[PDB]
Amino acid sequence: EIGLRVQPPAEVCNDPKCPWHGNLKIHGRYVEGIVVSDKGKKTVVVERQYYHYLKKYERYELRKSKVHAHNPECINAKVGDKVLIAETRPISKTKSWVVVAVLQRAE
Amino acid sequence: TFKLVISNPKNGVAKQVEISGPEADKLIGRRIGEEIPASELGLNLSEIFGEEIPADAKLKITGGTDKDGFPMRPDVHGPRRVKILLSRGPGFRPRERGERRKKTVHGNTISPNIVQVNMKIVF
Amino acid sequence: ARKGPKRHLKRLAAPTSWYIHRKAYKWAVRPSPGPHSMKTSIPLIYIVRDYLGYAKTAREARKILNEGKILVDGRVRKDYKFPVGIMDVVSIPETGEHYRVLPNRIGKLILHPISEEEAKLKPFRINNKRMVKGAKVQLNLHDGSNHLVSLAEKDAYKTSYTVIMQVPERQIVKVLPFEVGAYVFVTQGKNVARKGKIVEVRQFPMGWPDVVTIEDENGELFDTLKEYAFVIGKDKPEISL
Amino acid sequence: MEIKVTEIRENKLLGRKEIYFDVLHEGEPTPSREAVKGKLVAMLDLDPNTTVIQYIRSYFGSNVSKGYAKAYETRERMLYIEPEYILVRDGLVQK
RNA sequence: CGGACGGCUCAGUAACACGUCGGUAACCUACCCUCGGGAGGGGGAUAACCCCGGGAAACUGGGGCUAAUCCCCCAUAGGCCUGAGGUACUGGAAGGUCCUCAGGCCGAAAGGGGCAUGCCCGCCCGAGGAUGGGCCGGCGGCCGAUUAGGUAGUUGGUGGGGUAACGGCCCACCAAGCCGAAGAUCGGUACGGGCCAUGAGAGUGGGAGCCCGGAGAUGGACACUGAGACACGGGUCCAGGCCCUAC
Numbered sequence: 001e002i003g004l005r006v007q008p009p010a011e012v013c014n015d016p017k018c019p020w021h022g023n024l025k026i027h028g029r030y031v032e033g034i035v036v037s038d039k040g041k042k043t044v045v046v047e048r049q050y051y052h053y054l055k056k057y058e059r060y061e062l063r064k065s066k067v068h069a070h071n072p073e074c075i076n077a078k079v080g081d082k083v084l085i086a087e088t089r090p091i092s093k094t095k096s097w098v099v100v101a102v103l104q105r106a107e
Numbered sequence: 108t109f110k111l112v113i114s115n116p117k118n119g120v121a122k123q124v125e126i127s128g129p130e131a132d133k134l135i136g137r138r139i140g141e142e143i144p145a146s147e148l149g150l151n152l153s154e155i156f157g158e159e160i161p162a163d164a165k166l167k168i169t170g171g172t173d174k175d176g177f178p179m180r181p182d183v184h185g186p187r188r189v190k191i192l193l194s195r196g197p198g199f200r201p202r203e204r205g206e207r208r209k210k211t212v213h214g215n216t217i218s219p220n221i222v223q224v225n226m227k228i229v230f
Numbered sequence: 231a232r233k234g235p236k237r238h239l240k241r242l243a244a245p246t247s248w249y250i251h252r253k254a255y256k257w258a259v260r261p262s263p264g265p266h267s268m269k270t271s272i273p274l275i276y277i278v279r280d281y282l283g284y285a286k287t288a289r290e291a292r293k294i295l296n297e298g299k300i301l302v303d304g305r306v307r308k309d310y311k312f313p314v315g316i317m318d319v320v321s322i323p324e325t326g327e328h329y330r331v332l333p334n335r336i337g338k339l340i341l342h343p344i345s346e347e348e349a350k351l352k353p354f355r356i357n358n359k360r361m362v363k364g365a366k367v368q369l370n371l372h373d374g375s376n377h378l379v380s381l382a383e384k385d386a387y388k389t390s391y392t393v394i395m396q397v398p399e400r401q402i403v404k405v406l407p408f409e410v411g412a413y414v415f416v417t418q419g420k421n422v423a424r425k426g427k428i429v430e431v432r433q434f435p436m437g438w439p440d441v442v443t444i445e446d447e448n449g450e451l452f453d454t455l456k457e458y459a460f461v462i463g464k465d466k467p468e469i470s471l
Numbered sequence: 472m473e474i475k476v477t478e479i480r481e482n483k484l485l486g487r488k489e490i491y492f493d494v495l496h497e498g499e500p501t502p503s504r505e506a507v508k509g510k511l512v513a514m515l516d517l518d519p520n521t522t523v524i525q526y527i528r529s530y531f532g533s534n535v536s537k538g539y540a541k542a543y544e545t546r547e548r549m550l551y552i553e554p555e556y557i558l559v560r561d562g563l564v565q566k
Numbered sequence: 567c568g569g570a571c572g573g574c575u576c577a578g579u580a581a582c583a584c585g586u587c588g589g590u591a592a593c594c595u596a597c598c599c600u601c602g603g604g605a606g607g608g609g610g611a612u613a614a615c616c617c618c619g620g621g622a623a624a625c626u627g628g629g630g631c632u633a634a635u636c637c638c639c640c641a642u643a644g645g646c647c648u649g650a651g652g653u654a655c656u657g658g659a660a661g662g663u664c665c666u667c668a669g670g671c672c673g674a675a676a677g678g679g680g681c682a683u684g685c686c687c688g689c690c691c692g693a694g695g696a697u698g699g700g701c702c703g704g705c706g707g708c709c710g711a712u713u714a715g716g717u718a719g720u721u722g723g724u725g726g727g728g729u730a731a732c733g734g735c736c737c738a739c740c741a742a743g744c745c746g747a748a749g750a751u752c753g754g755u756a757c758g759g760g761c762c763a764u765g766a767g768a769g770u771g772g773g774a775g776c777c778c779g780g781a782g783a784u785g786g787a788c789a790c791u792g793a794g795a796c797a798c799g800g801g802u803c804c805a806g807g808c809c810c811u812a813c
C-alpha cells in the first residue's frame with residue numbers, strides 16, 4: 001500500500017517502473033494537473049495554473065508551469081484528463097514525476 | 108679517456124683508474140650486463156687493487172656517467188640521450204610519494220661521450 | 231573552491247544555542263564530531279572557561295582537562311573539542327559539583343545543579359531499532375549511542391520510549407513508555423523547555439512527521455513534534471528540572 | 472594608601488586563591504606593586520612568595536583603584552601554571 | 567600524521583550559479599562517539615653509515631652493511647554477486663536489515679610501544695551516529711523584436727556499459743518527438759544573496775571592504791598520490807614572456 005490514499009488500478013502491472021506492483025518509490029510532494037500532451041511513449045506533460053502577486057501594482061498575474069511525468073500502462077492517461085502526480089528519483093533527462101491516479105477523465 | 112671504478116664486494120672496496128687508447132676503444136659498443144676479462148684492457152688487479160685476485164677474473168659492466176653528468180639506464184637501449192617520465196630510479200630520487208619527473212639520461216650502450224664506468228668483479 | 235573539509239569556525243557563524251560573545255574575537259573552537267549534533271552541544275572548554283570560571287585562558291583549561299578532573303556521564307574526557315549536550319551530567323569531584331545540561335526557553339544551553347544520587351542516572355530516548363547478526367536487537371539512542379537487548383525482551387522497547395541507565399556501566403532500570411498520561415519535556419522548537427502531560431497524538435501521510443498535544447500545569451494546551459517530546463516520567467518527573 | 476578586600480574565591484583544580492581588592496589613595500599617586508603586596512600579605516597572612524599580583528588598575532577620576540592577586544600553595548605549581556611574564560613583572564624570577 | 571584548512575581576487579558565468587522549502591528507500595566520508603568482537607604463523611628489502619666517484623650548477627651512478635607502527639605471503643574472521651525459501655525489525659511505504667540453504671569470486675590486523683608488578687597510548691573487522699560533502703526536484707530573482715523560428719543524442723522507449731551513486735552520462739536498436747508571440751533561440755551586460763544609499767511613504771538606484779555560498783591561481787589542456795585534489799607554497803605538455811650558463 002503506497003503511502004498515498006487513493007484507489008489503486010484494477011490491473012496487475014509487471015513493469016518495474018510502476019509504484020503499484022513495482023519498484024518505483026514515491027517520496028515528497030503531490031499535486032494535481034491537466035494533461036496537455038500524450039505523444040511520447042509512457043510519457044505525459046502536465047500543466048497547473050497559479051496566480052503570482054505583484055506588489056508595486058497591488059495585483060496578480062496568472063502563470064502556467066509544465067512538468068514531464070512517467071505514465072504507466074496500468075494507469076493509462078490521455079489528453080484532457082485530470083491527474084495526480086508524485087515526485088520520485090530521476091527516470092530520464094526531463095522526467096522525475098509519476099502519475100498515481102486519474103481523478104476525472106475527458107472526452 | 109675513460110675512468111674506471113673497480114669494485115670488489117668480498118671486502119667492499121673500490122679503486123679508480125684512468126685509461127686511454129685501444130684498451131678504451133674496446134669497451135665501446137658493449138652494454139650493461141656484459142663480462143670482460145681484465146687483461147684485455149691492459150691492466151692487472153694484483154698490484155694496484157689489493158692483495159691477490161685469481162686469474163681468469165672477469166669485469167662486469169654496471170653503469171657510468173657522461174660529460175655533462177647524466178647517468179646511464181639499462182632499460183634504455185642505444186648510445187643516445189632521452190628525456191623520460193620517471194617514478195623510480197636509477198636516474199631519479201623521488202623524494203615524495205607518487206612523484207614523477209622528466210629526467211634526461213644516457214642509454215644502455217657505451218659511446219665516447221661517456222666519462223666514467225663502474226665495474227664489478229665476478230668470481 | 232573548497233577541495234576538502236573545514237577545520238575552522240568563525241565566531242559570527244557559531245550556533246545560537248551557545249553563550250558566546252560573538253564580536254570579541256574572530257575565531258571560535260570548531261567542535262569535533264561525536265555524541266550529539268552541533269545544534270545540541272557545546273565544547274568542554276567553553277564550560278570550563280566561560281560557564282563556570284575555573285580558568286581564564288585556554289592553556290589553563292587544557293591543563294585542567296589533561297590532569298583528568300572533568301567527567302561526562304561518569305567518564306574522563308581530556309579533549310577540549312568534545313561536545314557536551316542535552317541530559318549530559320558534568321561532574322567535578324574535587325569540588326563535589328554535579329550539573330545537568332538542559333535548554334532554556336530561549337533555546338540556549340544551561341547547567342542545572344543536582345545531587346550525587348541523581349548524578350548517577352541518565353535518561354535516553356530510543357530513536358531506532360535494528361536487527362543485528364545473531365538475531366539480536368540494537369537500540370539507537372538520542373545521543374547516537376547504542377545498546378543491545380535480546381529477542382525475548384524486544385516488545386518492551388519502542389522508538390519513542392525512554393530508558394534510564396547507570397551511566398559509566400550502562401545498566402538499564404525503569405523503562406518509561408510513550409503514552410497518553412506521560413510527563414514530557416520539550417527539547418527543541420518554539421516551545422522548548424515547556425513541560426506537561428501528553429493529551430493526544432496525530433499521524434499524517436506521505437512522510438510528514440507526527441504531532442503531539444500536551445497539557446501544562448496551568449491547563450494551557452499546546453503542540454509540538456513527537457520527536458521533540460522527551461518522556462521523563464509517568465505522572466511525575468523522575469529527574470529534576 | 473589603604474586596602475579593602477572585596478572578593479575571595481578558592482580554585483581547588485588549579486590550587487590557588489583568587490583575591491579581588493580595592494585600593495584607596497586620595498591625593499596620592501597610584502601605589503606600587505611592592506607596597507600593595509606588602510600590605511596584602513601583612514593583612515591576610517600569606518607567604519610573599521607563592522603570591523602574584525595580576526594587575527592594579529586606576530580609573531578616570533576616582534582615587535579608588537582595583538587590584539587582582541593570586542595566592543598559591545606551592546611554588547612548583549605556581550611556576551608550572553603561571554606564565555613567565557608576570558613573574559618577571561613582579562620580580563619573583565630573573566630572565 | 568598534516569600539508570585539500572587558513573589567506574587573496576572577482577576574470578569567467580543569465581546557470582539548479584544563488585535564495586528558500588523539501589528529497590536521496592539512488593551515494594561516499596580519515597580525524598571523533600557508542601556497542602559488539604579480534605590480534606595466529608612465516609618471510610624481504612632498503613635510507614642513513616663505509617670505500618670510489620660524475621657534473622659549472624640543477625642534479626645524479628656503482629659496490630658493501632643494517633632496522634621498524636616500512637613492504638610482502640599463508641590461514642582464519644570478514645566483504646561482494648546470484649538463485650531458492652522463511653517471516654524477526656524499522657518505516658508512510660521494502661527482499662533494505664535478520665534467519666536457512668546452495669554455487670562461487672575478493673580477502674584483515676602493529677599484541678606494536680610506556681610504566682610498573684594491572685594501567686596509559688596505539689592496530690583490524692562489524693552495526694549505528696556525528697561531521698563534511700556529492701546528486702535531484704518545486705517556487706523566486708536584468709535589458710533588447712532595426713534578434714522569429716530553433717533542436718538531430720536532439721525528445722522519449724527497450725536492452726546494456728560505466729559511476730560512489732539516479733540519470734542520453736555513454737553505446738546498440740525502435741520511433742518522432744522537445745522548445746516557442748504568456749518571447750524560444752541569438753546577442754548585450756553582470757559573480758549571487760544577507761544588506762546599503764535615498765525619500766513622508768509608495769518607490770527609485772547600487773550590491774568592493776563584514777558573514778554565507780560560487781568561481782579562479784600567466785592562457786589552455788591532462789594525470790599521479792591520497793578519506794578527500796585533476797591540487798593556492800606539488801607534477802606533464804603547447805603557446806606566450808623573463809632569468810642563470812663554462813653553450
Ligand SMILES: [Zn+2]
Pocket residue numbers: 009011012013014018020021022074
Ligand atoms: Zn500494477
